Amino acid sequence: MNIFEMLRIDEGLRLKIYKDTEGYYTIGIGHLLTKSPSLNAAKSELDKAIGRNCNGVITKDEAEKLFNQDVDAAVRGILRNAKLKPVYDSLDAVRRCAAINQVFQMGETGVAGFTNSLRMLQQKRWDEAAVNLAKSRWYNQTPNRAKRVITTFRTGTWDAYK
């Protein structure tokens, strides 16, 4: 298992514009296009990202290409955050995949206000972090996914991904 396979499992793959669980236009492998409710802004954004007139549809390759850049951006985002970097660098490789997944899903922003859990993960208080993390809108809105990421942080293994 690796980050791509884990996220490809959590986000799925769709080649036609779609609305995510928050109702926002997305495409590919969880690639958020825009928060606006105008399908047209969404398509403009898509064309701009891909580099061609897509008409709301892309290829697998284009999808994978956007996914590559998004994983990259997520990690770089972590590395550049002063509150995140130190935590991330303290974790083992499996758990680092769990950190990337959260940031890919919620942004550097979302994740940066999990201060208490961050502290707990840094101190390697797994079970404690796990209970804390569940006390969140993230877990209540997308519990099956949140459960899988939380178990990954708690155990350091890929068992939730079986």
In the annotated binding site, the residues are 32, 104, 117, 132
Interface with Cl ion, residue 61, by CB under 5 A:
no
Interface with Cl ion, residue 43, by CB under 5 A:
no
Work out how close the CB of 125 gets to Cl ion at its nearest, in angstroms, rounded to a whole number. 25
Task: Pick the binder of Cl ion from 145, 148, 149, 152 (CB under 5 A).
Answer: 145
* Nearest one of 33, 31, 91, 97 to 64, comparing CA atoms: 31
Work out how close the CB of 50 gets to Cl ion at its nearest, in angstroms, rounded to a whole number. 7
> Catalytic residue at 89?
no
Interface with Cl ion, residue 98, by CB under 5 A:
no
Among 10, 11, 45, 70, the active-site one is 11
> Catalytic residue at 47?
no
Q: What is the DSSP string of 111-160?
A: HHT-HHHHHHHHTT-HHHHHHHHHSSHHHHHSHHHHHHHHHHHHHSSSGG
* Nearest one of 68, 102, 72 to 87, comparing CA atoms: 102
Binding residues (CB under 5 A) for Cl ion: these are: 49, 142, 144-145
